[PDB]
């Protein structure tokens, strides 16, 4: 099952403990490997006590569709993961925000959905869990510990999020058009008017490919072409001490600027390793993250490095004839 990027599943001891603001791309990735980001969201927004992801971690998060390709690539980043990394926001749900059918919302404490305009989450709180429909949170004694299993976390869609290569607006609009040209029956996706209809059907499931080019709405696609390029950036490397654990901002920056630090073959190839010194000791070792690389999509005639890309479910409204 997938695999801890840098930190094993968390074994928390008290529901009332702090969620620290670590400052290193590493320290953060540890907090993601251990479902701290979700725990925070639950607390912050949905007024929740404790941690979700006990003993399991991000590796055990429940997914829909359960056959999630990107789940195996630990480095591939969910929408929630990237919120902690500042790349986007997962928003507290509003009545408007539609909860999709299909997923096994039951006992779930958190579920996340990419929406046509953004990314949204629906959190329960203390001693409660979602009903069999996602629509309501209800008392669940098996959630009284506040140290909850990872399975109570549902991330929907086969989403991969990454650092965008910013595109102009002209391109976005060209892309907007092409999608409408490709999907000419849809009227509103998740509530955002996609094509002019006046004759809308009632909201209905819709499973589509999509990328976040970095503008108002996601662009949806039928015939896309994806190439996963490897780029060996510093963000493609994580620095750890075998023992202490994650390394701190300076230690990482140092490692990623010095060579000295122990590392795997590629890290040496890229930035430098150094050996013959370590007697007993221990120093930060850095390693490449496990992922196909950075994805580049091809659509409308145009090649885009999108922020996020994936195939997810988005309630939508088709024409009337």
């Amino acid at each position: 099952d997938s695999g801890p990027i840098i930190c094993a599943g968390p074994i928390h001891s008290n529901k009332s403990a702090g969620i620290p603001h670590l400052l290193g791309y590493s320290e953060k990735i540890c907090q993601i490997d251990r479902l701290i980001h979700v725990s925070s969201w639950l607390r912050n927004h949905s007024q929740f006590q404790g941690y979700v992801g006990q003993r399991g971690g991000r590796s055990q998060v429940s997914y829909y569709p359960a056959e999630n390709s990107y789940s195996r690539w630990s480095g591939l980043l969910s929408p929630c993961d990237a919120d902690w990394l500042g790349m986007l926001v997962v928003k507290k749900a509003r009545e408007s925000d539609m909860i999709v059918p299909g997923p096994s919302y039951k006992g779930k404490v958190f579920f996340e959905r990419p929406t046509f305009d953004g990314y949204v989450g629906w959190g329960c709180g203390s001693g409660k869990s979602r009903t069999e429909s996602g629509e309501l949170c209800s008392s669940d004694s098996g959630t009284s510990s506040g140290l909850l299993p990872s399975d109570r976390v549902l991330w929907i869609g086969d989403v991969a999020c990454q650092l965008m290569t910013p595109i102009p607006e002209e391109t976005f609009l060209e892309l907007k058009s092409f999608s409408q040209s490709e999907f000419p029956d849809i009227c509103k996706i998740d509530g955002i008017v996609f094509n002019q209809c006046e004759g809308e059907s009632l909201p209905q499931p819709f499973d589509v490919a999509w990328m976040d080019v970095g503008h108002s709405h996601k662009i949806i696609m039928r015939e896309h072409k994806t190439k996963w390029v490897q780029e060996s950036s510093s963000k493609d490397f994580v620095c750890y001490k075998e023992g202490t654990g994650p390394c701190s901002e300076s230690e990482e920056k140092a490692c990623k600027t010095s060579g000295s630090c122990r590392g795997d073959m590629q890290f040496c190839k890229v930035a430098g390793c150094e050996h013959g010194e370590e007697t007993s000791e221990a120093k930060c070792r850095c390693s490449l993250v496990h992922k196909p690389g950075e994805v580049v999509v091809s659509y409308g005639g145009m090649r885009v490095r999108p922020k996020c890309y994936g195939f997810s479910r988005m309630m939508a409204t088709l024409h009337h004839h």
Epitope: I11, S13, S141, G142, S145, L147, P149
Partner: antibody, heavy 120, light 108 residues
Framework: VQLVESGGGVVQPGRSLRLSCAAS????????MHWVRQAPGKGLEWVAV????????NYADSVKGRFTISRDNSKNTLYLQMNSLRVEDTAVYYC??????????????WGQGTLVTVSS | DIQMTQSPSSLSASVGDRVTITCQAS??????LNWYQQKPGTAPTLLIY???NLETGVPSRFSGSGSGTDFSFTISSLRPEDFATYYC?????????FGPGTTMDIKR
Amino acid sequence: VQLVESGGGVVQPGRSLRLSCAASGFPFSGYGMHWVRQAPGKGLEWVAVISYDGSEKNYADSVKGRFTISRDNSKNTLYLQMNSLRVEDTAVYYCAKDRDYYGSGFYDYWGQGTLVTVSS
Amino acid sequence: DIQMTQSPSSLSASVGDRVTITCQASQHISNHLNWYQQKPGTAPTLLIYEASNLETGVPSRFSGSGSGTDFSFTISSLRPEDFATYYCQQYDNFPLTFGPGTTMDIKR
């Protein structure tokens, strides 16, 4: 909180026994449940664990194939079926609640113990 | 899997003096060692969890420290109640292993 054991007694090698850790005061269905035994004169040895809904079970060795742990969250009792009992298993048996959901290993509240002797 | 060895086997100190127990390990346990008190004839009681925290009701005389393999559990001012057997316990890897116990005894 109150865990209270019951079921212990004299038994001879080969026979089987059943224990029961009835609970009060606390949400029995939200916490994992343990079994810890103390041999007369010796120290502490954890026996078996069970999770919130009674699915994920992790026994120790020295009991695997001889011990089956179970629970009934409707009547708030913890069971432990001990078959193939041997002399090495003569000990005082405790049940313990766990702060977590699965039995991660925090024995916050202990029971008052019951005694099981195994000899012919 | 993980052998937890305590020391000393038995102390002999009188009321008011300061005690120190030591509990080692064969692997990195991180901050995942609990501590237990067991009075004779009673049931064990959790004193310190995660090697620093004091479970509700534990007085401030009892202290704990340690991270990795070597830990310690420090009583500063011994009182007649505090004379019992003390155990450490890891929870880094099931099966959950205990220590062999330290038997605090009084002195005259």
